[PDB]
Amino acid sequence: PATVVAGVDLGDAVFAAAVRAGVARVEQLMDTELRQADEVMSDSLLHLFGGKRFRPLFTVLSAQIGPQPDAAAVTVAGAVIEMIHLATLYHDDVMDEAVRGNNVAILAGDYLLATASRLVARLGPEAVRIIADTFAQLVTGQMRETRDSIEQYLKVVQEKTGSLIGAAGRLGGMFSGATDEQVERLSRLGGVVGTAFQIADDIIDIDSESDESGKLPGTDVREGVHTLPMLYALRESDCARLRALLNGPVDDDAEVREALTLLRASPGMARAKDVLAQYAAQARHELALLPDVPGRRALAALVDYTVSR
Amino acid sequence: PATVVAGVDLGDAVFAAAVRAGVARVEQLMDTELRQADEVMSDSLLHLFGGKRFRPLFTVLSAQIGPQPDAAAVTVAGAVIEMIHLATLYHDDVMDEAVRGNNVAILAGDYLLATASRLVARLGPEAVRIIADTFAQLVTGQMRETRDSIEQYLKVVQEKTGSLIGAAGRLGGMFSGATDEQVERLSRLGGVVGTAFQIADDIIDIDSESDESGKLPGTDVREGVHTLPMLYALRESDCARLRALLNGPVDDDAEVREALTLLRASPGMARAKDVLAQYAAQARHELALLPDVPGRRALAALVDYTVSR
């Protein structure tokens, strides 16, 4: 649809086409910079690099609050964020021994990080500082995922997902010339959006309906992984049968559906949906403190998408 | 000995004690910065972090050409270089499936890189640029190690070892206030030193004598790995028996000594020693273009150590 960009309906067509071109300049910049890499890199780098490009969208939408939403440096920031995102996927898939092998995945991701660093060097001192501080949080989060278990999970998703989208809002705001106050609100907005996005993803993966990309639920159950609704379910008074299923990876397709209908019917599925609604409210709050401009409506459509996709 | 620092004799005791304190301030800076990491990091980060600290020594020795050899930023540069070095070891040991496991090794190294980035953000734009460009070369080199085979090996060791020691000389020169010309010569010196260091290491690992750390030779033969003297040996007209041994990993301890006495007696061991002597001459050339100061004698003792250790 002429109003939709990267999976969210932004309203007016002249606005959606402005944002679309912004995301396209991020895309072009990343392809240009990645294609300069030595031949020995090509196979590794381009493998995990199209996309949904949520982070570039967030960066470009954040910049629409500023008086220069199409600043050259907004595109550079967009490319930096997306490259760090892509890089984390490579490194996760090694330590998980994961499908999305581990041959040369450490070095490729390591490149996406060098390259990210190359581009952020163009944005100046504070940007290099912002990104350094962010990547550092991002690691600690994946790290802590590696080990109050509920407090711990929420610290994980704030570090591993929240931080980087926080940085996208901060850099989008800064490089578009937004006020100091607007920069802080887009940063806070980004941190919450990233947190709600991960929790929504975790609920969706238990819900009986198929995901955005048409995927069936149960992956997290199968991989052993403990998500918010499971963490809540485990500490209730039946909850014993759940405990045994969830104790590790589940490979029997009936134990999968067994574990599912056990999770779905748990008070845990209620506690987790409540947590999501609290982060969604926190996001909508930060939105209400932005000016009443088409940029704000677009960011509200993005929150709406985040907490229902 | 009162004249020795990090395995090389620098001559005068007042000079060696100045350089020793410089390397100690790099050490202290790295420990301070690494100990601030979130608890979940500690186990991973401190595991691969004492040392021989060749890169900090090179950085501090390079700074002794400048009129401010003890500049605050020389210590920051020293810590940046050593952290990137340590980080590459973590990532190599995963893709090699290596002893020096791979559990959380991707993320730790990833931290050492975030932290490196945090410190280099203190040195300003061009430093962030230098390091970004360097890490990028460093990857391509490990990468190319992953695939004229001889030309290719030498490109590998220039990228994977040469680049970073090149950066150490460049940053040591810059932050000590050395001239533009002196900075370029310390950079070139560093690139060659790193190249000779790796080739010397590869020869030492075949020589019948034990290494610096008392290690017996043959590891590279055992791990399958092809080094300069093997690459030369393979393309001679006996050379057929060598080809079969070297075809992959060697686990039989007699085939190890068989492969050894075959490598030692090869014209390949002559071609490789000649390559080393050419890089040693290139290093000594760059040294002759530096001023006649105690810094130059110390760097000459370092080259002497590099090409015989």
Swiss-Prot record, chains A, B:
Residues binding Mg(2+) 1, per UniProt: D92, D96
Domain remark text: Contains the canonical two aspartate-rich DDxxD motifs, designated as FARM (the first aspartate-rich motif) and SARM (the second aspartate-rich motif). The primary role of the FARM and SARM is the chelation of the divalent magnesium ion cofactors that assist substrate binding and catalysis, but it may also play a role in determining product chain length.
GO biological process terms on file: geranylgeranyl diphosphate biosynthetic process; isoprenoid biosynthetic process
Name of the protein in question: Nonaprenyl diphosphate synthase
Organism lineage: Bacteria, Bacillati, Actinomycetota, Actinomycetes, Mycobacteriales
Keyword annotations from UniProtKB, A to Z: Lipid biosynthesis, Lipid metabolism, Magnesium, Metal-binding, Transferase
SUPFAM superfamilies for the chain: Terpenoid synthases (SSF48576)
Protein family membership: Belongs to the FPP/GGPP synthase family.
UniProt GO MF annotations: (2E,6E)-farnesyl diphosphate synthase activity; all-trans-nonaprenyl-diphosphate synthase (geranylgeranyl-diphosphate specific) activity; geranylgeranyl diphosphate synthase activity; metal ion binding; prenyltransferase activity
Reactions this protein catalyses: isopentenyl diphosphate + (2E)-geranyl diphosphate = (2E,6E)-farnesyl diphosphate + diphosphate; isopentenyl diphosphate + (2E,6E)-farnesyl diphosphate = (2E,6E,10E)-geranylgeranyl diphosphate + diphosphate; 5 isopentenyl diphosphate + (2E,6E,10E)-geranylgeranyl diphosphate = all-trans-nonaprenyl diphosphate + 5 diphosphate
Cofactor note: Binds 2 Mg(2+) ions per subunit.
EC numbers on record: 2.5.1.85, 2.5.1.10, 2.5.1.29
Positions of the record's site feature: Important for determining product chain length: D93, D201
Entry binding sites for isopentenyl diphosphate: K52, R55, H85
Cofactor: Mg(2+)
CDD domains named in the record: Trans_IPPS_HT
Pathways per UniProt: Isoprenoid biosynthesis; farnesyl diphosphate biosynthesis; farnesyl diphosphate from geranyl diphosphate and isopentenyl diphosphate; Isoprenoid biosynthesis; geranylgeranyl diphosphate biosynthesis; geranylgeranyl diphosphate from farnesyl diphosphate and isopentenyl diphosphate: step 1/1
